[PDB]
Protein backbone atom coordinates (compact mmCIF):
# COMPACT_ATOMS: atom_id res chain seq x y z
CA UNK A 1 0.00 0.00 0.00
CA UNK A 2 1.18 3.54 -0.68
CA UNK A 3 1.27 5.69 2.45
CA UNK A 4 2.23 9.37 2.80
CA UNK A 5 5.62 10.83 1.87
CA UNK A 6 6.47 7.98 -0.46
CA UNK A 7 6.32 5.39 2.29
CA UNK A 8 4.72 1.96 1.93
CA UNK A 9 3.19 -0.71 4.12
CA UNK A 10 2.08 -4.22 3.38
CA UNK A 11 -1.30 -3.48 4.94
CA UNK A 12 -3.15 -0.31 3.96
CA UNK A 13 -4.50 0.06 7.51
CA UNK A 14 -0.92 0.68 8.73
CA UNK A 15 -0.63 3.87 6.68
CA UNK A 16 -2.37 6.02 9.29
CA UNK A 17 0.44 5.19 11.71
CA UNK A 18 3.00 6.97 9.51
CA UNK A 19 0.96 10.16 9.95
CA UNK A 20 0.65 9.57 13.70
CA UNK A 21 4.44 8.98 13.77
CA UNK A 22 5.19 12.30 12.09
CA UNK A 23 2.92 14.19 14.49
CA UNK A 24 4.20 12.68 17.71
CA UNK A 25 7.82 12.84 16.64
CA UNK A 26 7.62 16.54 15.71
CA UNK A 27 5.25 17.70 18.43
CA UNK A 28 4.72 15.40 21.45
CA UNK A 29 8.37 14.29 21.48
CA UNK A 30 9.85 17.68 20.40
CA UNK A 31 11.70 16.37 17.39
CA UNK A 32 12.29 12.73 18.16
CA UNK A 33 13.78 13.22 21.63
CA UNK A 34 14.01 10.58 24.38
CA UNK A 35 12.91 13.04 27.06
CA UNK A 36 10.07 13.63 29.48
CA UNK A 37 7.14 12.81 27.16
CA UNK A 38 8.82 9.59 25.99
CA UNK A 39 9.48 8.52 29.58
CA UNK A 40 5.85 9.24 30.54
CA UNK A 41 4.53 7.45 27.48
CA UNK A 42 6.60 4.37 28.18
CA UNK A 43 5.30 4.26 31.75
CA UNK A 44 1.75 4.64 30.43
CA UNK A 45 2.08 1.45 28.34
CA UNK A 46 2.45 -0.47 31.61
CA UNK A 47 -0.28 1.37 33.53
CA UNK A 48 -2.75 0.66 30.75
CA UNK A 49 -1.69 -2.96 30.11
CA UNK A 50 -1.19 -4.30 33.59
CA UNK A 51 -4.87 -3.84 34.49
CA UNK A 52 -5.41 -7.50 33.60
CA UNK A 53 -5.99 -10.22 36.19
CA UNK A 54 -6.82 -13.81 35.42
CA UNK A 55 -7.00 -14.26 39.24
CA UNK A 56 -10.06 -12.05 39.34
CA UNK A 57 -11.61 -13.51 36.18
CA UNK A 58 -11.36 -17.01 37.63
CA UNK A 59 -13.26 -15.94 40.69
CA UNK A 60 -16.07 -14.60 38.49
CA UNK A 61 -15.00 -11.00 38.81
CA UNK A 62 -13.98 -8.56 36.09
CA UNK A 63 -10.20 -8.77 35.78
CA UNK A 64 -9.56 -5.78 33.44
CA UNK A 65 -9.10 -5.68 29.70
CA UNK A 66 -5.30 -5.21 29.63
CA UNK A 67 -3.86 -3.09 26.81
CA UNK A 68 -7.27 -1.68 25.94
CA UNK A 69 -7.04 2.11 26.31
CA UNK A 70 -9.06 1.95 29.54
CA UNK A 71 -6.78 4.30 31.44
CA UNK A 72 -7.48 6.94 28.78
CA UNK A 73 -11.17 6.32 28.00
CA UNK A 74 -11.86 6.02 31.76
CA UNK A 75 -9.21 8.44 32.91
CA UNK A 76 -11.46 10.02 35.47
CA UNK A 77 -11.68 6.66 37.28
CA UNK A 78 -8.28 5.11 36.65
CA UNK A 79 -6.01 8.15 37.07
CA UNK A 80 -7.41 8.57 40.56
CA UNK A 81 -6.16 5.16 41.66
CA UNK A 82 -3.28 5.70 44.08
CA UNK A 83 -0.90 3.67 41.96
CA UNK A 84 -1.71 5.92 39.02
CA UNK A 85 -0.42 9.09 40.63
CA UNK A 86 1.35 11.17 38.04
CA UNK A 87 -0.14 9.65 34.96
CA UNK A 88 -2.89 12.04 34.12
CA UNK A 89 -0.53 14.63 32.59
CA UNK A 90 0.51 12.35 29.76
CA UNK A 91 -2.94 10.83 29.39
CA UNK A 92 -4.40 14.27 28.75
CA UNK A 93 -1.67 15.13 26.27
CA UNK A 94 -2.14 11.90 24.36
CA UNK A 95 -5.94 11.68 24.33
CA UNK A 96 -6.66 14.53 21.84
CA UNK A 97 -3.87 13.25 19.51
CA UNK A 98 -5.47 9.81 19.33
CA UNK A 99 -8.87 11.40 18.71
CA UNK A 100 -7.57 13.78 16.01
CA UNK A 101 -6.04 10.83 14.13
CA UNK A 102 -9.03 8.56 14.93
CA UNK A 103 -6.87 5.75 16.20
CA UNK A 104 -7.85 3.71 19.24
CA UNK A 105 -6.56 4.70 22.66
CA UNK A 106 -5.07 1.28 23.33
CA UNK A 107 -3.22 1.31 20.04
CA UNK A 108 -2.07 4.91 20.54
CA UNK A 109 -0.68 4.25 24.00
CA UNK A 110 1.40 1.31 22.77
CA UNK A 111 2.47 3.18 19.62
CA UNK A 112 3.68 6.20 21.60
CA UNK A 113 5.71 3.92 23.86
CA UNK A 114 7.23 2.04 20.93
CA UNK A 115 8.03 5.16 18.87
CA UNK A 116 9.26 7.04 21.90
CA UNK A 117 11.56 4.29 23.15
CA UNK A 118 13.12 4.03 19.69
CA UNK A 119 14.34 7.60 20.17
CA UNK A 120 16.51 6.62 23.14
CA UNK A 121 20.21 5.93 22.45
CA UNK A 122 20.65 2.22 21.99
CA UNK A 123 16.91 1.83 22.39
CA UNK A 124 14.57 -0.97 21.47
CA UNK A 125 12.39 -1.39 18.37
CA UNK A 126 9.26 -2.77 19.94
CA UNK A 127 6.72 -4.69 17.83
CA UNK A 128 3.64 -2.65 17.06
CA UNK A 129 0.30 -4.32 16.32
CA UNK A 130 -2.88 -2.31 15.61
CA UNK A 131 -6.60 -2.91 15.96
CA UNK A 132 -7.43 -2.75 19.66
CA UNK A 133 -11.04 -1.73 20.37
CA UNK A 134 -12.03 1.30 22.39
CA UNK A 135 -15.05 -0.55 23.82
CA UNK A 136 -13.93 -1.80 27.23
CA UNK A 137 -14.55 -1.17 30.96
CA UNK A 138 -12.43 0.57 33.62
CA UNK A 139 -9.68 -1.51 35.19
CA UNK A 140 -10.22 -2.74 38.73
CA UNK A 141 -8.12 -0.84 41.26
CA UNK A 142 -5.11 -2.41 42.96
CA UNK A 143 -3.61 -4.03 39.85
CA UNK A 144 -0.64 -1.74 39.34
CA UNK A 145 2.45 -2.56 41.44
CA UNK A 146 3.64 0.17 43.82
CA UNK A 147 7.20 0.99 44.83
CA UNK A 148 6.51 -0.06 48.44
CA UNK A 149 5.17 -3.51 47.51
CA UNK A 150 7.34 -6.47 48.50
CA UNK A 151 9.15 -8.52 45.88
CA UNK A 152 6.73 -11.38 46.69
CA UNK A 153 3.79 -9.08 45.98
CA UNK A 154 5.25 -7.61 42.77
CA UNK A 155 6.18 -11.04 41.41
CA UNK A 156 2.73 -12.47 42.23
CA UNK A 157 0.97 -9.54 40.55
CA UNK A 158 3.18 -9.65 37.48
CA UNK A 159 2.92 -13.46 37.42
CA UNK A 160 -0.87 -13.26 37.40
CA UNK A 161 -0.58 -10.92 34.41
CA UNK A 162 1.69 -13.48 32.69
CA UNK A 163 5.31 -12.54 33.43
CA UNK A 164 8.01 -14.66 34.96
CA UNK A 165 10.55 -13.01 37.33
CA UNK A 166 13.12 -12.71 34.52
CA UNK A 167 10.58 -10.82 32.43
CA UNK A 168 9.81 -8.44 35.30
CA UNK A 169 13.54 -7.62 35.40
CA UNK A 170 13.66 -7.18 31.62
CA UNK A 171 10.64 -4.81 31.72
CA UNK A 172 12.44 -2.76 34.35
CA UNK A 173 15.04 -1.89 31.74
CA UNK A 174 12.52 0.91 31.21
CA UNK A 175 13.90 2.48 34.39
CA UNK A 176 17.05 3.20 32.39
CA UNK A 177 15.08 5.98 30.71
CA UNK A 178 13.00 7.23 33.61
CA UNK A 179 12.43 9.69 36.45
CA UNK A 180 9.95 10.31 39.26
CA UNK A 181 7.56 13.17 39.93
CA UNK A 182 5.21 12.04 42.69
CA UNK A 183 7.25 10.07 45.25
CA UNK A 184 9.11 13.27 46.23
CA UNK A 185 7.55 16.19 44.30
CA UNK A 186 10.32 18.53 45.29
CA UNK A 187 12.79 16.29 43.40
CA UNK A 188 10.56 15.85 40.41
CA UNK A 189 12.55 14.94 37.32
CA UNK A 190 15.43 13.24 39.15
CA UNK A 191 16.13 10.05 37.19
CA UNK A 192 16.64 6.44 38.21
CA UNK A 193 20.01 6.27 36.47
CA UNK A 194 22.73 8.62 35.32
CA UNK A 195 21.67 8.37 31.67
CA UNK A 196 17.91 8.87 31.28
CA UNK A 197 18.17 9.34 27.49
CA UNK A 198 20.31 6.22 26.96
CA UNK A 199 18.71 2.79 27.00
CA UNK A 200 21.72 1.27 28.75
CA UNK A 201 22.63 -0.84 31.75
CA UNK A 202 23.54 2.04 34.09
CA UNK A 203 20.24 1.52 35.94
CA UNK A 204 21.17 -2.05 36.78
CA UNK A 205 24.64 -1.05 37.94
CA UNK A 206 23.63 1.99 39.97
CA UNK A 207 20.76 0.36 41.82
CA UNK A 208 23.34 -2.17 43.17
CA UNK A 209 25.42 0.57 44.80
CA UNK A 210 25.01 1.16 48.52
CA UNK A 211 22.42 3.84 49.23
CA UNK A 212 24.12 6.70 51.00
CA UNK A 213 22.18 9.96 50.28
CA UNK A 214 18.82 11.48 51.12
CA UNK A 215 18.48 13.70 48.07
CA UNK A 216 15.79 16.06 49.42
CA UNK A 217 15.01 17.03 52.98
CA UNK A 218 13.65 13.60 53.85
CA UNK A 219 12.76 10.17 52.54
CA UNK A 220 9.23 9.45 51.40
CA UNK A 221 7.01 6.39 51.04
CA UNK A 222 8.38 4.28 48.19
CA UNK A 223 11.87 5.83 48.27
CA UNK A 224 15.14 4.71 49.83
CA UNK A 225 18.57 6.42 49.93
CA UNK A 226 20.25 6.99 46.60
CA UNK A 227 23.92 6.39 45.76
CA UNK A 228 24.69 9.43 43.62
CA UNK A 229 23.76 13.14 43.63
CA UNK A 230 20.87 13.80 41.29
CA UNK A 231 19.67 10.15 41.21
CA UNK A 232 16.47 8.86 42.77
CA UNK A 233 16.06 5.29 44.14
CA UNK A 234 12.84 3.35 44.52
CA UNK A 235 12.39 0.88 47.36
CA UNK A 236 11.17 -1.77 44.95
CA UNK A 237 14.11 -1.49 42.55
CA UNK A 238 16.53 -1.73 45.46
CA UNK A 239 14.83 -4.91 46.70
CA UNK A 240 14.52 -6.54 43.28
CA UNK A 241 18.21 -5.97 42.55
CA UNK A 242 19.11 -7.86 45.77
CA UNK A 243 16.38 -10.55 46.08
CA UNK A 244 17.52 -14.06 45.18
CA UNK A 245 14.52 -14.54 42.86
CA UNK A 246 15.59 -11.66 40.60
CA UNK A 247 19.20 -10.72 41.46
CA UNK A 248 20.98 -12.88 38.92
CA UNK A 249 18.84 -11.64 36.04
CA UNK A 250 19.35 -8.05 37.28
CA UNK A 251 23.11 -8.61 37.15
CA UNK A 252 22.79 -10.36 33.78
CA UNK A 253 22.06 -7.04 32.06
CA UNK A 254 25.43 -5.85 33.38
CA UNK A 255 27.28 -9.06 32.49
CA UNK A 256 25.60 -9.25 29.06
CA UNK A 257 24.34 -5.79 28.09
CA UNK A 258 23.60 -6.86 24.52
CA UNK A 259 20.68 -8.92 25.87
CA UNK A 260 18.81 -5.95 27.33
CA UNK A 261 17.20 -4.76 24.11
CA UNK A 262 16.05 -8.19 22.85
CA UNK A 263 14.70 -9.27 26.23
CA UNK A 264 12.90 -5.94 26.72
CA UNK A 265 11.47 -6.14 23.23
CA UNK A 266 10.03 -9.62 23.79
CA UNK A 267 8.53 -8.74 27.17
CA UNK A 268 7.04 -5.50 25.79
CA UNK A 269 5.45 -7.30 22.83
CA UNK A 270 3.64 -9.46 25.40
CA UNK A 271 2.70 -6.58 27.63
CA UNK A 272 1.36 -4.55 24.70
CA UNK A 273 -1.04 -7.38 23.87
CA UNK A 274 -2.43 -8.28 27.30
CA UNK A 275 -6.16 -8.72 26.86
CA UNK A 276 -5.76 -9.02 23.09
CA UNK A 277 -5.32 -11.79 20.48
CA UNK A 278 -2.44 -10.84 18.15
CA UNK A 279 -3.88 -13.04 15.45
CA UNK A 280 -6.82 -10.66 15.36
CA UNK A 281 -4.63 -7.50 15.11
CA UNK A 282 -2.50 -6.28 12.18
CA UNK A 283 1.27 -5.93 12.24
CA UNK A 284 2.39 -2.34 11.73
CA UNK A 285 5.85 -2.88 13.20
CA UNK A 286 7.63 -1.44 10.19
CA UNK A 287 6.35 2.05 11.15
CA UNK A 288 8.43 2.12 14.31
CA UNK A 289 11.78 3.82 13.57
CA UNK A 290 15.00 1.87 13.75
CA UNK A 291 16.87 2.90 16.93
CA UNK A 292 20.35 4.38 16.79
CA UNK A 293 23.33 4.09 19.08
CA UNK A 294 25.78 1.37 20.07
CA UNK A 295 25.53 -1.00 23.01
CA UNK A 296 27.40 0.89 25.66
CA UNK A 297 29.86 -0.71 28.09
CA UNK A 298 28.45 -0.36 31.62
CA UNK A 299 30.75 1.45 34.01
CA UNK A 300 31.09 2.26 37.66
CA UNK A 301 30.40 5.93 38.40
CA UNK A 302 33.31 8.21 39.13
CA UNK A 303 34.31 7.94 42.76
CA UNK A 304 32.74 4.50 43.26
CA UNK A 305 34.47 1.17 43.61
CA UNK A 306 33.51 -2.46 43.58
CA UNK A 307 33.32 -2.27 47.39
CA UNK A 308 30.30 0.06 46.95
CA UNK A 309 28.44 -2.64 44.97
CA UNK A 310 26.18 -4.91 47.04
CA UNK A 311 26.68 -7.96 44.86
CA UNK A 312 23.67 -10.20 45.18
CA UNK A 313 23.84 -13.03 42.57
CA UNK A 314 24.82 -16.19 44.31
CA UNK A 315 26.01 -18.17 41.36
CA UNK A 316 28.16 -15.51 39.64
CA UNK A 317 30.37 -12.62 40.71
CA UNK A 318 29.70 -9.06 39.65
CA UNK A 319 31.52 -8.40 36.36
CA UNK A 320 34.68 -6.39 36.03
CA UNK A 321 33.66 -2.96 34.79
CA UNK A 322 35.68 0.12 33.96
CA UNK A 323 35.38 3.01 36.43
CA UNK A 324 34.82 6.50 35.18
CA UNK A 325 37.80 8.74 35.95
CA UNK A 326 37.72 11.78 38.17
CA UNK A 327 34.98 12.99 40.46
CA UNK A 328 31.28 12.50 40.06
CA UNK A 329 29.08 15.34 38.66
CA UNK A 330 25.53 15.49 39.91
CA UNK A 331 23.06 14.01 37.41
CA UNK A 332 20.92 16.66 35.70
CA UNK A 333 17.17 16.41 36.22
CA UNK A 334 15.16 15.56 33.14
CA UNK A 335 13.78 18.76 31.46
CA UNK A 336 10.00 19.25 31.16
CA UNK A 337 7.88 21.99 29.57
C1 LIG B 1 7.63 -3.85 38.38
C2 LIG B 1 7.08 -2.88 39.13
C3 LIG B 1 7.23 -1.41 38.86
C4 LIG B 1 7.16 -0.46 39.84
C5 LIG B 1 6.91 -0.69 41.32
C6 LIG B 1 7.41 0.82 39.22
C7 LIG B 1 7.40 2.04 39.89
C8 LIG B 1 7.60 3.25 39.30
C9 LIG B 1 7.54 4.52 40.02
C10 LIG B 1 7.19 4.68 41.49
C11 LIG B 1 7.87 5.50 39.16
C12 LIG B 1 7.84 7.01 39.36
C13 LIG B 1 6.42 7.54 39.26
C14 LIG B 1 6.42 9.01 39.67
O1 LIG B 1 6.68 9.32 40.78
O2 LIG B 1 6.47 9.91 38.78
C15 LIG B 1 8.08 4.86 37.86
C16 LIG B 1 8.46 5.52 36.71
C17 LIG B 1 8.58 4.90 35.45
N1 LIG B 1 8.29 3.58 35.23
FE1 LIG B 1 8.19 2.07 36.54
N2 LIG B 1 7.59 0.64 37.84
C18 LIG B 1 7.45 -0.72 37.62
C19 LIG B 1 7.42 -1.24 36.33
C20 LIG B 1 7.50 -0.55 35.16
C21 LIG B 1 7.32 -1.13 33.84
C22 LIG B 1 6.95 -2.60 33.65
C23 LIG B 1 7.51 -0.16 32.96
C24 LIG B 1 7.40 -0.20 31.45
C25 LIG B 1 7.86 -1.18 30.71
C26 LIG B 1 7.82 1.06 33.67
C27 LIG B 1 8.22 2.25 33.13
C28 LIG B 1 8.50 3.41 33.83
C29 LIG B 1 9.01 4.58 33.22
C30 LIG B 1 9.47 4.78 31.77
C31 LIG B 1 9.04 5.55 34.28
C32 LIG B 1 9.45 6.98 34.12
C33 LIG B 1 8.28 7.95 34.04
C34 LIG B 1 8.73 9.38 33.95
O3 LIG B 1 9.87 9.74 33.80
O4 LIG B 1 7.72 10.23 34.00
N3 LIG B 1 7.78 0.79 35.03
N4 LIG B 1 7.93 3.48 37.98
CA1 LIG C 1 -6.13 -1.04 30.59
CA1 LIG D 1 20.04 4.94 31.18
Numbering used by the authors: 2 to 338
Structure paper excerpt:
The heterologous expression of the POD genes from the P. ostreatus genome, and subsequent kinetic studies, reveal a peroxidase array consisting of three VPs and six MnPs. The VP1 and MnP4 crystal structures were solved as representative for the two POD families present in the P. ostreatus genome. The overall structure of VP1 and MnP4 showed a heme group dividing the protein into a distal largely helical domain (formed by four main helices and two to three small ones) with one structural calcium ion, and a proximal domain composed by another six helices and a non-ordered region stabilized by a second calcium ion. The site where this takes place is conserved and comprises three acidic residues (E36/E40/D175 in VP1 and E36/E40/D181 in MnP4) located near the heme propionate occupying the most internal position with respect to the main access channel.
The resulting inventory revealed the absence of lignin peroxidases (LiPs) and the presence of three versatile peroxidases (VPs) and six manganese peroxidases (MnPs), the crystal structures of two of them (VP1 and MnP4) were solved at 1.0 to 1.1 Å showing significant structural differences. Concerning short MnP, whose crystal structure is now solved for the first time (from P. ostreatus MnP4), its main structural difference from P. chrysosporium long MnP concerns the existence of a more exposed Mn oxidation site, due to the absence of the C-terminal extension that in P. chrysosporium MnP (with a total of 357 residues) is partially fixed by a fifth disulfide bridge. The oxidation of lignin-related substrates was not detected in MnP4, where the active tryptophan is substituted by an alanine (left). At this site, the P56 to G59 loop of VP1 presents a six-residue insertion in MnP4 forming a small extra helix that protrudes into the solvent. Also, residues A130 and V131 in this VP1 region adopted a different conformation with respect to V135 and T136 in MnP4. These changes allow the F62 hydrophobic side chain of MnP4 to interact with K137 and, due to this interaction, the hydroxyl group of T136 interacts with one of the waters coordinating the distal calcium ion. Most of them involve the change of small hydrophobic side chains in VP1 for large hydrophilic side chains, such as the substitution of G290 in VP1 by K296 in MnP4. This lysine has interactions with D198 and D200, which are directly involved in the coordination of the proximal calcium. When the MnP4 crystal structure was solved, a striking observation was the high number of solvent-exposed lysines (a total of 20) and other basic residues (up to a total of 34). Another noteworthy characteristic of MnP4 is the high number of surface-exposed lysines (up to a total of 20) and other alkaline residues (up to a total of 35) compared with the other P. ostreatus PODs, which would result in a higher net positive charge of the protein and increased stability at acidic pH.
